[PDB]
């Protein structure tokens, strides 16, 4: 329970907020997708295609284990699915970057939707969104409204840390 872990959907801007936060609080910033992708020598798309989702999820689960040994606190941005690992419990204080369905759908591109059929019909897209939101909300210490831009998300994270310094 040492780090500030940002969770949420693709496109909620976790990374960007993570970096800002690193600067703000004088802390190192890590990114789970970047770690795994720089290791394997492939992008994340390329991993799922070349290696399979199961294999990525194993890298991911393993990587959580590693990060729980870091000594100093860091700000960690995480991939969308990371919240599926029981393992993630104990890594740190999770903040959900809450973004709305409409804007998250608009933020996806063609390559993203090309390979995931659930994103292409309304009904399933919403159903997916609802069940995974509930999973981010379950697993979150703080919910952050990301709809107001990065600065406003940053102001909320800092509010909470101002109030409970045991966090950082
Ligand atoms: N509570 C949960 C549980 C599972 C999630 C989850 O599995 C996610 N992403 N999943 C996939 C699965 C297959 C993919 C696939 O086969 C290709 C690509 S890609 O070409 O765009 O890189 C991305 C893929 C993302 C995302 S979330 O959408 O990442 O938020 C969020 C999730 C949130």
Numbering used by the authors: 1 to 168
Task: Cite, word for word, the article reporting this structure.
SK catalyzes the specific phosphorylation of the 3-hydroxyl group of shikimic acid, using ATP as a co-substrate. The shikimate pathway is comprised of seven enzymatic components that convert erythrose 4-phosphate and phosphoenolpyruvate into chorismate, for subsequent synthesis of aromatic compounds. SKs belong to a class of P-loop kinases that share a homologous α-β-α fold. Overall, these structures have a characteristic α-β-α fold that consists of the CORE domain (residues 1–31, 61–108, and 124–162), the SB domain (residues 32–60), and the LID region (residues 109–123) in the monomer.
